Amino acid sequence: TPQNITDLCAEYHNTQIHTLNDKIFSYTESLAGKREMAIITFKNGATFQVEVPGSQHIDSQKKAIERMKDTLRIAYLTEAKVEKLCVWNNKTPHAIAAISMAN
Amino acid sequence: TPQNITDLCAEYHNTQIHTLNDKIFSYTESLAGKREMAIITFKNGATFQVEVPGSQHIDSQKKAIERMKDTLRIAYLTEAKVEKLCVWNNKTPHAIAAISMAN
Amino acid sequence: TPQNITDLCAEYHNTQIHTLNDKIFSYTESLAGKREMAIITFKNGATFQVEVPGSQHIDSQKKAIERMKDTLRIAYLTEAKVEKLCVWNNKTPHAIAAISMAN
Amino acid sequence: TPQNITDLCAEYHNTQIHTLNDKIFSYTESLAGKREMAIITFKNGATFQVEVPGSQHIDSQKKAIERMKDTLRIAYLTEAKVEKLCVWNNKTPHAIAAISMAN
Amino acid sequence: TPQNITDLCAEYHNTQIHTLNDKIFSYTESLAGKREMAIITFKNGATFQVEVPGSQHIDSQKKAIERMKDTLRIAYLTEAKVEKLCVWNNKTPHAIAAISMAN
Numbered sequence: 160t161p162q163n164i165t166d167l168c169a170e171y172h173n174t175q176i177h178t179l180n181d182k183i184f185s186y187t188e189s190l191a192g193k194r195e196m197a198i199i200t201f202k203n204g205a206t207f208q209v210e211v212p213g214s215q216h217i218d219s220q221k222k223a224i225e226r227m228k229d230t231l232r233i234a235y236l237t238e239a240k241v242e243k244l245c246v247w248n249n250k251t252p253h254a255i256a257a258i259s260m261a262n
Numbered sequence: 263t264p265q266n267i268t269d270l271c272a273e274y275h276n277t278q279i280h281t282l283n284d285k286i287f288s289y290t291e292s293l294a295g296k297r298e299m300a301i302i303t304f305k306n307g308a309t310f311q312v313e314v315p316g317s318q319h320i321d322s323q324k325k326a327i328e329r330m331k332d333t334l335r336i337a338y339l340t341e342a343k344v345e346k347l348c349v350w351n352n353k354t355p356h357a358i359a360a361i362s363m364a365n
Numbered sequence: 366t367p368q369n370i371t372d373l374c375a376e377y378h379n380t381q382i383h384t385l386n387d388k389i390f391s392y393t394e395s396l397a398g399k400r401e402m403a404i405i406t407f408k409n410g411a412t413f414q415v416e417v418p419g420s421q422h423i424d425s426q427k428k429a430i431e432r433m434k435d436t437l438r439i440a441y442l443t444e445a446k447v448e449k450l451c452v453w454n455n456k457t458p459h460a461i462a463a464i465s466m467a468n
Numbered sequence: 469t470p471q472n473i474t475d476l477c478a479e480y481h482n483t484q485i486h487t488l489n490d491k492i493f494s495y496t497e498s499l500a501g502k503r504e505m506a507i508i509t510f511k512n513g514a515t516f517q518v519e520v521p522g523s524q525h526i527d528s529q530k531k532a533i534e535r536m537k538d539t540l541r542i543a544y545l546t547e548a549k550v551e552k553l554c555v556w557n558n559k560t561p562h563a564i565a566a567i568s569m570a571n
Numbered sequence: 572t573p574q575n576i577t578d579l580c581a582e583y584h585n586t587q588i589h590t591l592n593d594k595i596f597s598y599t600e601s602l603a604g605k606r607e608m609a610i611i612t613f614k615n616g617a618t619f620q621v622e623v624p625g626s627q628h629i630d631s632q633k634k635a636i637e638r639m640k641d642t643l644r645i646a647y648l649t650e651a652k653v654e655k656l657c658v659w660n661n662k663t664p665h666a667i668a669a670i671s672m673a674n
């Protein structure tokens with residue numbers, strides 16, 4: 160299995176790594192119908208989403224999407240430094256596939 | 263997808279943005295039948311609810327309503343500044359649709 | 366919907382408000398069969414329970430009872446001041462219906 | 469209902485109170501098959517388990533077992549003093565039925 | 572049942588104990604399809620995974636897999652010392668079976 164987020168990200172099409180090495184600057188979450196999603200930004204302005212669950216997701220990703228939003232909220236609150244994000248770049252904002260945290 | 267809470271709010275009828283830039287002053291939660299909801303206030307008296315789940319909501323919103331109540335509780339206990347709330351203004355207290363947190 | 370815990374409490378029979386304005390002195394939780402409950406106390410000796418889910422509870426209350434125990438746990442560990450409790454005073458210990466936290 | 473852990477404990481057979489008045493020294497958790505359990509120890513060497521869910525447990529206990537492991541984890545990480553444990557003493561290590569935290 | 576992680580680890584084939592006695596250096600999690608997993612590293616370079624739920628796991632392990640990722644995340648964020656990891660060494664990175672935390 161992948162040793163790290165870079166190797167993981169390279170298993171998928173339409174993905175790229177973002178190297179932030181910074182805490183999350185803003186955390187937004189919505190319960191509005193058809194927009195049950197989270198959005199994060201970094202101080203430089205870069206913005207990322209956790210997509211609404213949809214037909215592009217297999218069933219096993221549903222639990223992981225929920226975990227990711229949990230992760231991002233606690234990371235935000237604790238000011239944890241985000242090392243990298245693996246994202247799908249065929250979406251706007253780019254859609255988070257994975258996160259790594261390291262100080 | 264929207265890039266921010268103001269753009270997400272504009273996708274819906276009966277909504278408005280409240281810009282708080284302050285921590286939550288009080289957090290109330292109830293398990294009473296037909297009033298399984300949360301209510302928050304800010305120092306200025308502005309009061310908001312997470313609605314009881316009902317026939318207005320679609321299935322995808324159920325998990326999101328639960329997550330929002332989680333978010334408000336931890337925001338309250340950590341003293342996190344709430345930047346904005348997107349709310350439906352056809353309810354009293356105004357009903358939370360989305361929240362943004364920023365330093 | 367109610368704007369605050371006092372008005373919420375007044376919608377129900379057999380309830381009262383307790384004003385504590387104090388942190389929780391003790392937190393107790395059990396997984397013993399038929400006693401899957403939580404008990405909290407304050408330094409003045411006031412004792413409250415989160416009832417075991419029963420026939421008095423409607424389906425919508427189930428997730429809220431679980432959330433309440435979550436809330437009491439974290440409130441205890443963070444030493445959060447409890448403002449008021451809305452309780453059913455037709456049970457001993459009085460049974461928690463709602464909680465407000467402020468100050 | 470019981471007002472405290474000692475009275476609760478006394479409603480069951482094969483139980484005893486252990487008085488710790490101390491934080492948890494170690495926390496261990498496993499996902500290995502048939503050993504999906506938690507183990508905690510105290511600096512006096514006392515060791516306790518949250519048992520693997522089994523045929524002895526009624527349905528209402530399943531959620532409470534999960535909650536207890538959540539509680540022990542957070543108690544460990546926050547260095548919360550454990551007052552007492554109600555345990556079943558017909559298991560080795562003794563099996564937790566209830567926990568009280570104070571002081 | 573086992574009283575500690577070493578004894579629990581010994582009950583399984585293809586396992587070994589790693590003694591870290593250190594906080595987690597990095598925490599990675601993914602929601603990408605078929606890679607819904609977590610990876611952790613330590614400053615000595617040691618890398619470990621929580622495997623994707625698969626046909627090697629029994630039902631009872633599914634909740635525990637989810638709990639382990641929760642535990643790792645919060646351990647990382649609180650800089651909790653990890654004492655030992657019980658792992659399967661027939662996977663690369665070695666796959667976490669159990670964790671012990673102690674001061």
Ligand SMILES: CCNC1C(=O)C(=O)C1NC(COC(=O)NCCCCCC(=O)N[C@@H]1O[C@H](CO)[C@H](O)[C@H](O)[C@H]1O)COC(=O)NCCCCCC(=O)N[C@@H]1O[C@H](CO)[C@H](O)[C@H](O)[C@H]1O
Nearest residue numbers: 396397398481482519523524525526529556557558559563
């Ligand atoms: C009802 C299913 N039984 C059991 C349990 O849940 C449990 O522990 C059960 N049985 C225990 C072990 O019993 C035996 O070893 N029995 C076999 C040997 C018996 C020799 C006698 C014999 O041959 N009798 C013959 O039996 C035949 C039928 O086979 C005929 O009837 C014939 O007529 C007769 O002569 C016994 O354990 C107890 O005494 N236990 C206390 C009660 C436990 C009830 C459930 C419970 O509350 N368990 C508790 O759950 C907690 C979690 O909620 C904790 O896990 C506690 O540790 C746990 O006790």
Ligand SMILES: COC(=O)NCCCCCC(=O)N[C@@H]1O[C@H](CO)[C@H](O)[C@H](O)[C@H]1O
Nearest residue numbers: 294295379416420421422423453455456460
């Ligand atoms: C005996 O078991 C039951 O079915 N009781 C149900 C009768 C109808 C329930 C009426 C009711 O509102 N009970 C009330 O429920 C509350 C929980 O929601 C509290 O437990 C109050 O103490 C109880 O008076």
Ligand SMILES: COC(=O)NCCCCCC(=O)N[C@@H]1O[C@H](CO)[C@H](O)[C@H](O)[C@H]1O
Nearest residue numbers: 500501502503582583584585626627628629
């Ligand atoms: C984790 O491994 C297990 O719990 N079980 C697998 C061990 C079984 C391998 C050896 C084997 O095939 N034993 C065979 O089991 C069969 C049932 O399946 C029959 O009882 C055979 O008589 C026995 O020789």
Ligand SMILES: COC(=O)NCCCCCC(=O)N[C@@H]1O[C@H](CO)[C@H](O)[C@H](O)[C@H]1O
Nearest residue numbers: 500501585622626627628629659661662666
């Ligand atoms: C023994 O009987 C069972 O209940 N079997 C269920 C299937 C699992 C048997 C094979 C097995 O033990 N695989 C082992 O699973 C572990 C997870 O639990 C790890 O993935 C190990 O790398 C793998 O070798």
Ligand SMILES: CCNC1C(=O)C(=O)C1NC
Nearest residue numbers: 581582583584585586661
């Ligand atoms: C059939 C003999 N037994 C086994 C085998 O082959 C395995 O692998 C076994 N069990 C752990």
